């Protein structure tokens, strides 16, 4: 239907400035104001401010006034958030939500754009199969990567039932490691082909590992 497409993630060093974007597929601009809500890890939602795309009318919650800026371009139907003097505190998920004019907000929301404030270098992952040996379990090991996240899909997204993509863990190396599994019937092992698609946009890595018995 209507889609508020934001990027998946950006990593900046401390003091550098980011620009969270939000493409509004739709539906269509305008006559739908836009606001920015942020979600720090495990903590609730925090209201940052609004925008009138009609003609860039803005409001900021005191605590965001001075460090944030919301721009909007009527041409590409894209709205922005520019946070300055980035601190490790600013590490959160930045939401682009569409404000309905009566009953306030937020019928359609955006995917989230995790922002990581870190001095560390990008690193692509290493994809290894987890081989099966009347329900068998097979998987993928997405080892040694930075930063989070990685998107793991099975059979180009066609396989969804019983898929378990585990929460990533921090190794002693400071690199994340993840594992994605799927329970399948033992009968389909000879018939069906199982291939995990692994994506890591920060390092521009795209792997398709075929899991064999």
């Amino acid at each position: 239907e209507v889609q508020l497409v934001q990027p998946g993630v950006e990593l900046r060093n401390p003091g550098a400035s980011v620009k969270v974007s939000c493409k509004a597929s739709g539906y269509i601009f305008t006559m739908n104001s836009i606001d920015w809500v942020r979600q720090a890890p495990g903590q609730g939602l925090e209201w940052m401010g609004r925008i009138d795309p009609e003609d860039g009318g803005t409001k900021y919650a005191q605590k965001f006034q001075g460090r944030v800026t919301f721009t909007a371009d009527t041409s590409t139907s894209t709205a922005y958030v520019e946070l300055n003097s980035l601190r490790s505190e600013d590490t959160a998920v930045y939401y682009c939500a569409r404000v309905d004019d009566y009953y306030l907000g937020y019928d359609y929301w955006g995917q989230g754009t995790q922002v990581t404030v870190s001095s560390a270098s990008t690193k692509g992952p290493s994809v290894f199969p987890l081989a099966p040996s009347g329900t068998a379990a097979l998987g993928c090991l997405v080892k040694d990567y930075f930063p989070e996240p990685v998107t793991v899909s099975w059979n180009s997204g066609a396989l969804t039932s019983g898929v378990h993509t585990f929460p990533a863990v921090l190794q002693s190396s400071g690199l994340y490691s993840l594992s994605s599994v799927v329970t399948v019937p033992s009968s389909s092992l000879g018939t069906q082909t199982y291939i995990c698609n692994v994506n890591h946009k920060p390092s521009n890595t795209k792997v398709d590992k075929k899991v064999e018995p």
């Binding site: 939602l45 907000g105 937020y106 929301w109 090991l141 929460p167 594992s179 599994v181």
Partner: protein, 219 residues
């Protein structure tokens, strides 16, 4: 001013079918005198997902939202009510005001679910030949669809208990069956892995009468 949203309780646990109630109180009236409309909205957030609007105008249901979800209350006291609480309804619930600037959300309220004790289906995976190439060996242990969350895993290399070389991660509760899944990974240098034959994973859960053990021989 600056309205404040207060959610009660902070967390809830209920059986499949029982009636669930979440209360939200605002420091100032969010009802607009002339249109006699309460500026209150309820949202359902799940892990790794954007919040989802359920109730708006304090009592109006959104298109495609189950009938079980119901909005009520007026002026300051508002209540989200799930009647036939289902496994899908295990998520975080937030109340949001729209009456004045800045906009305010609630602290959130975690709803949970109770289920029959489910034993884990245990699986063991040896390291791949390509992972070996580069002097590392990671051994994965799978604890598929189990309840409660509480469980014990023990690595036994050549029947000798391992300590300080493993790491585990647990999934959130399932939307369909309401179970958990656990992954423990034993990481050794190629030289240490090449030293031993047997690799065992010992699982202790209340759904299991005796500790289940899955093992393998290197080559």
């Amino acid at each position: 001013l600056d309205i404040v949203m207060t959610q009660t309780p902070t967390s809830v646990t209920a059986s499949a079918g029982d009636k669930v109630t979440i209360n939200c109180k605002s420091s100032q009236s969010v009802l607009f005198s002339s249109n006699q409309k309460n500026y209150l909205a309820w949202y359902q957030q799940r892990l790794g997902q954007s919040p989802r609007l359920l109730i708006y105008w304090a009592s109006i249901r959104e298109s495609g939202v189950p009938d079980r979800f119901s909005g009520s209350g007026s002026a300051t006291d508002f209540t989200l009510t799930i009647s036939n609480f289902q496994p899908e309804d295990a998520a975080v619930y937030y109340c949001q005001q729209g009456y004045s600037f800045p906009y305010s959300f609630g602290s959130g309220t975690r709803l949970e679910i109770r289920r029959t004790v489910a034993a884990p289906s245990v699986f063991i995976f040896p390291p791949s030949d390509e992972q070996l190439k580069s002097g590392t060996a990671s051994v994965v242990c799978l604890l598929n669809n189990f309840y409660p969350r509480e469980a014990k895993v023990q690595w036994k290399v050549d029947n000798a208990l391992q300590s300080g070389n493993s790491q585990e991660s647990v999934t959130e509760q399932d939307s369909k069956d309401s179970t958990y899944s656990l992954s423990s990974t034993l990481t050794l240098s190629k030289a240490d892995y090449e030293k031993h034959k047997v690799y065992a994973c010992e699982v202790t859960h209340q759904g299991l009468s005796s500790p289940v053990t899955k093992s393998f021989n290197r080559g």
